[PDB]
From a paper:
Tipα, therefore, is an important pathogenic effector of H. pylori that promotes host inflammation and tumor progression. Tipα is secreted as homodimer by H. pylori independent of the type IV secretion system. The active form of Tipα can bind the gastric epithelial cells and subsequently be translocated into the cytoplasm.
Here we report the crystal structure of the N-terminal-truncated Tipα starting from the residue Cys25 (TipαN25) that retains both inter-molecular disulfide bridges. Our TipαN25 is always dimer independent of pH values or protein concentrations under non-reductive conditions. In the crystal structure, TipαN25 adopts an intrinsic dimeric organization as the active unit, which features two flexible disulfide bonds at the N-terminus linking two monomers of the unit to form a tweezer-like configuration. A homodimer, linked by inter-subunit disulfide bonds at the N-terminus, is present in an asymmetric unit. Two subunits of a TipαN25 homodimer related by a local twofold axis are arranged in an anti-parallelly way to form a unique shoulder-to-shoulder dimeric mode. The N-terminal loops (25–33), where the two inter-chain disulfide bonds are located are structurally flexible and not visible in the experimental electron density map, implying their nature of intrinsic flexibility. Tethered by flexible disulfide bonds at the N-terminus, two subunits of TipαN25 are assembled in an almost anti-parallel shoulder-to-shoulder mode with the dimer interface mainly mediated through β sheets. The whole structure of TipαN25 homodimer resembles the shape of a pair of tongs, with the disulfide bridges as pivot and a pair of anti-parallel β sheets as jaws of the tongs to clip targets for its functional performances. The dimer interface buries a contact area of 4813.3Å2, reaching 30% of the total accessible surface area, which is primarily contributed by β sheets.
Numbering used by the authors:
A (entry chain A): 34 to 181
B (entry chain B): 35 to 181
Write the structure that this text describes.
Amino acid sequence: NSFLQDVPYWMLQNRSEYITQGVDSSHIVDGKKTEEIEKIATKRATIRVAQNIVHKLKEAYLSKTNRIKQKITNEMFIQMTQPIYDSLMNVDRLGIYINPNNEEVFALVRARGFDKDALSEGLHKMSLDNQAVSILVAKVEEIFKDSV
Amino acid sequence: SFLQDVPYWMLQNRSEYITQGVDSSHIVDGKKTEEIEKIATKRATIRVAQNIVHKLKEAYLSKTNRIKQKITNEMFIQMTQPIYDSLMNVDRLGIYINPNNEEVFALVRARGFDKDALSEGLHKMSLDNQAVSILVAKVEEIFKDSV
């Protein structure tokens, strides 16, 4: 009953709770080279960090210390994923890992920052009031500074 | 931050047993966990097929190979279908969801296969008689050596 070998520690962890760090995979599409399945896995991972940020935001919203009075529907929160992803910058691929069982590529990624203008603008197009946007931007702002 | 309840099998290369396979499926909208589990299970079952093809391709490319007919890679790949088709009594030994990305993994093992099924399927594929006989023989071995 031999166990897998050469398995990075980050794979044994729940990185998605660093919020700015996301892990995701991609099955090896046949017609593609490993290098490309890594591209796909990396995008997914960075999208994941976006979702991580949204999940953190949705948490604070549903928190009892939430100051946002506008109603933000579950669907809206999913919408936020896009503007947030759009604003991410300086995203490093910290690692890759391929599981032998099914040849699936995993990628560890970290977004080092985001454009405040970009996020703000994006959130505004989404139909949140000024107060909400200010608070939301203020929060992903803290999520990032508090991530170092 | 270490993942808590990770099954032991998730830490092993289960496709080492050939008749066992592990594969996954990403979570998906409109889809409940229950059916992403169904999807992962089928992919895992296909792995078993793939594991079996991979094992045959090994013996075919080994020194002790007796199949004189040449079998291309595209052929070996298509050998997957008939093998999968013939699988029977496939049990789902486990399910594991990775918190990092809500991806469902599934562990399965095919307890058997139908000689007739595989044979017929292999013949349709364009292998000579001796080729089929040997391959079906080898797949027999694979399953007995997994008990």
